Design a protein around this ligand. Sequence first.
Ligand SMILES: O=C(O)CCC(=O)C(=O)O
Ligand SMILES: O=C(O)CCC(=O)C(=O)O
Lengths: 213, 213, 86, 84
Amino acid sequence: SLLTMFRELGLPLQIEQFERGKTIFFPGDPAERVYLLVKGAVKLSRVYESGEEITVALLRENSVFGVLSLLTGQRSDRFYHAVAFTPVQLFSVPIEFMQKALIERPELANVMLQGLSSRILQTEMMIETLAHRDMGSRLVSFLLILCRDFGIPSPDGITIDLKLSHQAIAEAIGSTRVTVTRLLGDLRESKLIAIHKKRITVFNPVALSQQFS
Amino acid sequence: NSLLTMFRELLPLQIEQFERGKTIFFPGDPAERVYLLVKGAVKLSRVYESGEEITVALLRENSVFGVLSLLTGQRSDRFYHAVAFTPVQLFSVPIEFMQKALIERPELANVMLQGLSSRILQTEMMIETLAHRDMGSRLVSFLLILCRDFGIPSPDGITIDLKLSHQAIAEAIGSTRVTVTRLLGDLRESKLIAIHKKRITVFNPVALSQQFS
Amino acid sequence: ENYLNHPTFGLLYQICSFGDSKELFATLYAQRLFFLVAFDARGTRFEPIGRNEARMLVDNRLRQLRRDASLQEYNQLQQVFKQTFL
Amino acid sequence: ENYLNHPTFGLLYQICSFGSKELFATLYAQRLFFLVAFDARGTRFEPIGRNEARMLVDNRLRQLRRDASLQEYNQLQQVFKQTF
DNA sequence: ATTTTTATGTATCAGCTGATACATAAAAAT
DNA sequence: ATTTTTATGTATCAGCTGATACATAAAAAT
Ligand SMILES: O=C(O)CCC(=O)C(=O)O
Ligand SMILES: O=C(O)CCC(=O)C(=O)O
């Protein structure tokens, strides 16, 4: 329904195209719009001056972002790095043309709240993952989430439909790339995962989920 | 205070009192309500079968929670542990009584979207903290947030107005109580903080924040 | 082990198939939420429920299969039931 | 050294006083800058962008320098120097 | 098809920090 | 006020994991 409502904020609203790795918004850009990722994935990241990049969350389909614009207004500026992790199609409404649109159609106001709710929980699920001490448990917990959002059914196991570099991952669970390759190898020999054509695949993710009760 | 103003009008509504340590909702409960903490602190936590607790978010005054109810309603069951970490006063409106009240008063619809948006940013700010590798940087990053939420002006430094048990901290930053007492002992010597009667007082929190720009 | 892609909560994994053609599905991580899926021509609608309400639904399906079907089908649900609730 | 707390935002720290409207910045990593006016009927909060909040202090610097005391000009420069 | 950039596999180390125990202080209970 | 339950300070050592470097494969640029 988030997909249905956004398409009615104009007369028709046009769909933006974003190529792989192409950045949507950058830190210090004014936030004037509320966005809705329709297809693909979007990487929100904190970027230090040291150059080290920390992935805050990896959004999935039908996710609402640009949450800061709603409260801040155009005046304030972004503090995160919104990058198109995969080829992505998204919508974009100026917040001012949204607040007016909220009061005209309160039915859409309801749809939105639910969308933001999902975000909260999804971001909270992340907290769980990083809240682990055991990097092994932390990696897996993360991989589970990946199966949930970007995963596509494959005969041996769920395969995440995305291309993920060891670094891109290491940036997500708060560790180094070395430790990522290191641990992944351990899960290769334990035969719990598999990597072919640069795409990851977990084996019976449900069993892994039970360990985390 | 709009959040505080609008919630009040859902005849009027009387405020709920929770004693220290007393639980608001447990896991498994029918998530049929949306809450708005007015004063005091609410500890949202995940609890494993192993019995261990992971603090997801430590809420502040004028913070909206119980967000799951807006998605599925009274049909689905909780999975987080909502505890009153400090003596707390809050409101509680049933999702249904809300869903209708949102359409009736379009002024309130926006008030809610802003409040959930803060939580997404707050929950995201937590990610940053835990995303550190260095437990030292991680602890501080956390202490910074506490000053931002529960902190009060004290002459030498900002004293967070809350009492934190080493464990309670350990549970929040994904570490052990031992390391907490250990790291705290280092920050005393480094003369960046001071502890009296379980009150944590940072000196020039600004300086400490300068690290992360 | 049979999957279905919820728009919001992502991948869901099948628990069992009821006689009404209605099927019970569950969240991939931690079995946090349960759903009743009904396949209408353009329906494929989702209907959320709680674990208690979800347990008894499978319970009914447990008894029906044993009396009027093969032990293995009953056992296969029993596996699921055994793991999912116990 | 002066802290005020916008309720959604959390605690904020003073940067400069324009003259007495004041500019307050967010505590964690100064992500948001807010203009605050101490009206008798309540405080008022207005967020502004980084680039803009900069020039606003700039003008104040020259004004402390050319019309006022030595001390004060230095102090504001400290905050400016650090904040940027 | 050539080169040269990026990603992955493997090697090496040092130092946290988790794990366990104890001592002591603080708080709660009696 | 006395006791006894909880919180904090300290001691220990083992091992993972960050830091550093390289090999090699894969990919991207040219
Ligand atoms: O709102 C922003 O600009 C940063 C964070 C964000 O986009 C989001 O959480 O969806
Ligand atoms: O929404 C729930 O039921 C659990 C999480 C929550 O309460 C919150 O995000 O405030």
